[PDB]
Design a protein around this ligand. Structure first.
Ligand SMILES: *[C@@H]1O[C@H](CO[C@@H]2O[C@@H](C)[C@@H](O)[C@@H](O)[C@@H]2O)[C@@H](O[C@@H]2O[C@H](CO)[C@@H](O[C@@H]3O[C@H](CO)[C@@H](O)[C@H](O)[C@@H]3O)[C@H](O)[C@H]2NC(C)=O)[C@H](O)[C@H]1NC(C)=O
Ligand SMILES: *[C@@H]1O[C@H](CO)[C@@H](O[C@@H]2O[C@H](CO)[C@@H](O[C@@H]3O[C@H](CO)[C@@H](O)[C@H](O)[C@@H]3O)[C@H](O)[C@H]2NC(C)=O)[C@H](O)[C@H]1NC(C)=O
Ligand SMILES: *[C@@H]1O[C@H](CO)[C@@H](O[C@@H]2O[C@H](CO)[C@@H](O[C@@H]3O[C@H](CO)[C@@H](O)[C@H](O)[C@@H]3O)[C@H](O)[C@H]2NC(C)=O)[C@H](O)[C@H]1NC(C)=O
Ligand SMILES: *[C@@H]1O[C@H](CO[C@@H]2O[C@@H](C)[C@@H](O)[C@@H](O)[C@@H]2O)[C@@H](O[C@@H]2O[C@H](CO)[C@@H](O)[C@H](O)[C@H]2NC(C)=O)[C@H](O)[C@H]1NC(C)=O
Ligand SMILES: *[C@@H]1O[C@H](CO)[C@@H](O[C@@H]2O[C@H](CO)[C@@H](O)[C@H](O)[C@H]2NC(C)=O)[C@H](O)[C@H]1NC(C)=O
Ligand SMILES: *[C@@H]1O[C@H](CO)[C@@H](O[C@@H]2O[C@H](CO)[C@@H](O)[C@H](O)[C@H]2NC(C)=O)[C@H](O)[C@H]1NC(C)=O
Ligand SMILES: *[C@@H]1O[C@H](CO)[C@@H](O[C@@H]2O[C@H](CO)[C@@H](O)[C@H](O)[C@H]2NC(C)=O)[C@H](O)[C@H]1NC(C)=O
Ligand SMILES: *[C@@H]1O[C@H](CO)[C@@H](O)[C@H](O)[C@H]1NC(C)=O
Ligand SMILES: *[C@@H]1O[C@H](CO)[C@@H](O)[C@H](O)[C@H]1NC(C)=O
Length: 644
């Protein structure tokens, strides 16, 4: 003991970057107070049995640790320190050791197989180091082990089959590592196992069919491995399971119907695999299921109608599969279902009337299916909606009657459907709505002016519809819009000057419309605008000077209009202009030949204009095709179509 105190002092004397304020200040007077006042030291019969120096800012190694001098150690916690070097084999010499923790440290090298000498060890903790090499097989000798945690290391090789001999192991955590090879089937002998976490490794091979003997495992995390084969139906015999996560693997075959026998399973993660076949209707018998995610697979056929029996279902992720048939009503019938994502499948028919029956549905994704028919009325009145995506379907109906007021709506996408009718002012009640996308529908009538009062709107896409009327100057109220797409409609009259005020505008498209008269001379106040498409309109007269004061333009398309006069020399301030399309206008005069100053002009079309003179000195004019430069009155100094 005084010998133990002296030995520990010699070890302390090797620590580096220590401070006067370190808790090891109490290591004084070895002859009298080793067992009564030394921090981290506790004794029985005046001999140290417990060394607990966790989180004491110790920087050092275990090279000079006095293994020989502390024979009676049974509790060693040296975690959360700055220990470096390796774990010496002499740690296996502490024959009374029960608890061993060296976890949050900077240790390197392999685990000494001599740890298998620690026959009294019940807890082994070495997490969050840089330990490499294979896990020693002799660790399977430690039959009193209750818990092994080796996660967040650089361990390689297979899990030793000897671990099947650890009949008292409750928790096996090995997750953040590079463990390899097949999972040893002997793990099925761990009858006391409760938590098995092998996730985030490089495990290959099949899931052992012996896993069905693990009747006390509640958490089986094996996600983010390279497991192949099919999910063995024996997994359905792990009756105590509440969390089964096998996602991000290379599993194949069908989902075993035996999963329906897991009456305690609340979380099932099977996504990001290559599962095929139909979803067994028995999967509706997992009465406890909360969070069911089998998305991103190759599942086919219909979703079983028996899903109506999953009364605790909250999250259902079936996106990116090949599911077919109509969506059965039981799929949305859970009173607590808040997320129902079905997008990127082959669902047909109309939406079931059960969609928002409880008024709790929040996120609904249906993108890229073959669905049709009208919006069910419980969805029209789903006041709890937050995110609704319908893009790429054949939904039909009066858009004003099909959608109620959605006060919690954040994101809605109606793109690529057959919606008719006029945009209702009801959308202004969505005061949190940031994006409203309705491209490629049969919307008609005017844009209600309430839309411009939606100052929170970040993205507005009404493109490719049959919307008409003149845009009012109150459009300026869309303070925070950054993507504005009204192209492909029959909007008429002058472009409102008020677009000047949309300071956050980045991408503006008013092309393919019936806007007439001069482009607003005032339109020079969009410093974030990198894209402006005014093409295919009825705009006339000289190109306004204001456009040249917008700095960040990358693409500018004013083609297919009746603009006349000369191209401004004062384009020079568009040093970031890359693509410039001015074809099919009535522009005149010479190109200023200050376009040599323009660095980034690569794609330019000036065809079918009344311009004359020589092309300027920059790439796009050299790289222009005949169509790009044709149609002008007097082209080039030597009447050329290519090569000066
Ligand atoms: C397990 O890891 C050890 C330690 O590796 C060290 O720590 C890791 C976390 C990484 O940061 C490694 O980049 C780092 O080196 C490996 O042992 C180490 O091997 C290297 C080379 O194989 C040794 O470096 C040599 O050192 C001598 C002088 O001492 C030079 O002459 C050489 O040119 C070379 O620089 C290093 O000393 C050694 N460290 C030890 C033994 O503590 C070990 O190979 C690795 N095992 C695996 C990956 O299976
Ligand atoms: C070394 O000293 C530290 C702190 O002085 C000890 O930390 C304590 O460890 C126990 C577990 O042994 C912690 O209790 C646990 O609390 C959670 C809370 O939910 C509970 O669920 C567990 O069942 C367990 O009882 C305790 O909170 C923790 N205290 C602190 C301040 O971190 C450590 O046990 C000592 N180790 C040895 C070997 O002496
Ligand atoms: C600005 O918006 C207009 C739409 O209002 C965009 O027009 C599209 O431009 C391409 C060429 O750039 C068009 O031409 C050709 O169509 C034929 C047949 O489909 C095909 O052979 C060509 O490969 C090319 O696609 C295209 O039809 C046209 N679309 C429409 C609806 O008119 C224009 O591109 C936008 N400007 C910029 C810079 O993006
Ligand atoms: C294409 O433009 C020519 C050029 O006329 C321009 O008219 C002004 C707006 C201004 O830009 C002038 O500097 C230009 O000359 C049109 O030709 C003119 O047509 C009008 C008849 O409306 C006639 O009085 C003018 O004398 C013409 N000018 C010239 C130079 O010939 C032409 O009609 C336009 N073509 C189309 C299809 O719109
Ligand atoms: C600490 O270790 C020593 C030996 O490493 C133990 O001392 C032995 O105790 C037994 C019975 O108590 C004696 O028969 C031996 O002769 C002792 N050997 C020595 C070298 O002293 C001691 O009991 C241990 N103490 C604790 C609390 O474990
Ligand atoms: C297991 O599946 C993963 C899918 O994530 C495969 O990883 C992809 O492999 C291909 C190239 O072979 C590409 O799609 C990507 O480069 C990989 N990563 C992805 C998609 O994130 C992996 O190859 C599969 N292993 C097998 C089949 O043995
Ligand atoms: C449910 O929908 C909400 C709203 O769209 C999602 O949360 C938003 O996610 C975007 C990223 O695409 C963020 O920019 C927003 O800040 C998020 N908003 C909120 C309030 O969190 C949410 O991720 C969706 N959840 C599921 C499971 O689909
Ligand atoms: C002590 O800390 C400094 C600062 O982080 C570091 O550069 C040095 O390597 C550490 N060790 C020694 C022995 O100085
Ligand atoms: C498990 O223990 C038994 C006990 O005799 C032994 O025969 C067997 O080889 C052990 N398994 C491994 C993989 O070492």
């Amino acid at each position: 003991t005084v010998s133990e105190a002296n030995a520990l002092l010699k070890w302390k004397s090797t620590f580096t970057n220590q401070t006067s304020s370190s808790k090891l200040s109490s290591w004084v007077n070895p002859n009298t107070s080793f067992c009564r006042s030394w921090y981290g030291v506790s004794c029985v019969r005046n001999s140290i049995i417990r060394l607990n120096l966790t989180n004491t800012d110790i920087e050092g190694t275990f090279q000079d640790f006095p293994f020989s001098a502390l024979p009676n150690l049974s509790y060693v916690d040296l975690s959360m320190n700055r220990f470096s070097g390796t774990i010496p084999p002499q740690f296996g010499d502490f024959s009374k050791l029960i608890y061993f923790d060296l976890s949050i440290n900077q240790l390197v090298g392999e685990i000494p197989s001599e740890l298998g000498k620690l026959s009294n060890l019940e807890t082994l903790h070495l997490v969050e180091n840089k330990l490499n090499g294979s896990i020693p097989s002799e660790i399977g000798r430690l039959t009193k082990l209750h818990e092994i945690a080796l996660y967040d290391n650089l361990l390689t090789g297979p899990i030793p089959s000897s671990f099947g001999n650890l009949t008292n192991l409750a928790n096996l955590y090995l997750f953040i590592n590079s463990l390899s090879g097949p999972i040893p089937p002997e793990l099925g002998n761990l009858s006391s196992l409760a938590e098995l976490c092998l996730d985030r490794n490089k495990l290959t091979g099949q899931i052992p069919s012996s896993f069905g003997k693990l009747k006390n495992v509640t958490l089986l995390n094996m996600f983010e491995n390279n497991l192949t084969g099919e999910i063995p139906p024996e997994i359905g015999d792990m009756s105590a399971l509440d969390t089964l996560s096998l996602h991000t693997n290379n599993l194949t075959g069908s989902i075993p119907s035996s999963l329906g026998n897991l009456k305690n399973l609340a979380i099932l993660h099977l996504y990001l695999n290559k599962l095929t076949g139909s979803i067994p209707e028995e999967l509706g018998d997992m009465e406890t299921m909360i969070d069911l995610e089998i998305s991103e697979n190759k599942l086919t056929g219909p979703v079983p109608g028996s899903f109506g029996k999953l009364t605790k279902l909250e999250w259902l992720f079936l996106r990116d599969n090949h599911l077919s048939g109509p969506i059965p009503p039981g799929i949305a019938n859970s009173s607590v279902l808040t997320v129902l994502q079905l997008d990127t499948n082959n669902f047909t028919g109309v939406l079931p009337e059960t969609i928002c029956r409880s008024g709790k549905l929040e996120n609904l994704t249906l993108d890229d299916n073959l669905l049709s028919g009208p919006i069910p009325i419980s969805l029209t009145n789903c006041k709890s909606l937050i995110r609704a995506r319908f893009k790429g379907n054949s939904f039909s109906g009066d858009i004003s009657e099909s959608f109620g007021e959605y006060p919690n709506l954040n994101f809605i996408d109606l793109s690529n459907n057959k919606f008719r009718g006029q945009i209702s002012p009801k959308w202004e009640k969505s005061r949190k709505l940031v994006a409203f996308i309705a491209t490629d529908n049969n919307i008609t009538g005017p844009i209600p002016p309430e839309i411009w009062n939606m100052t929170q709107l970040n993205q507005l896409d009404l493109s490719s519809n049959n919307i008409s009327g003149e845009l009012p100057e109150t459009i300026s109220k869309l303070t925070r819009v950054s993507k504005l797409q009204l192209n492909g409609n029959q909007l008429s009259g002058r472009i409102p000057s008020g677009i000047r005020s949309l300071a956050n505008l980045e991408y503006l498209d008013l092309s393919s419309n019936r806007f007439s008269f001069q482009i607003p001379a005032t339109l020079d106040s969009l410093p974030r605008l990198y894209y402006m498409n005014l093409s295919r309109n009825d705009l006339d007269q000289n190109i306004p000077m204001g456009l040249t004061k917008l700095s960040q333009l990358q693409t500018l398309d004013l083609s297919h209009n009746n603009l006349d006069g000369e191209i401004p020399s004062q384009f020079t301030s568009l040093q970031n202009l890359e693509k410039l399309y001015l074809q099919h206008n009535n522009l005149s005069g010479p190109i200023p030949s200050s376009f040599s100053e323009m660095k980034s002009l690569t794609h330019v079309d000036v065809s079918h204009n009344n311009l004359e003179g020589p092309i300027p000195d920059n790439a796009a004019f050299k790289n222009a095709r005949p169509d790009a430069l044709e149609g002008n009155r007097d082209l080039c100094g030597s009447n050329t179509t290519q090569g000066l």
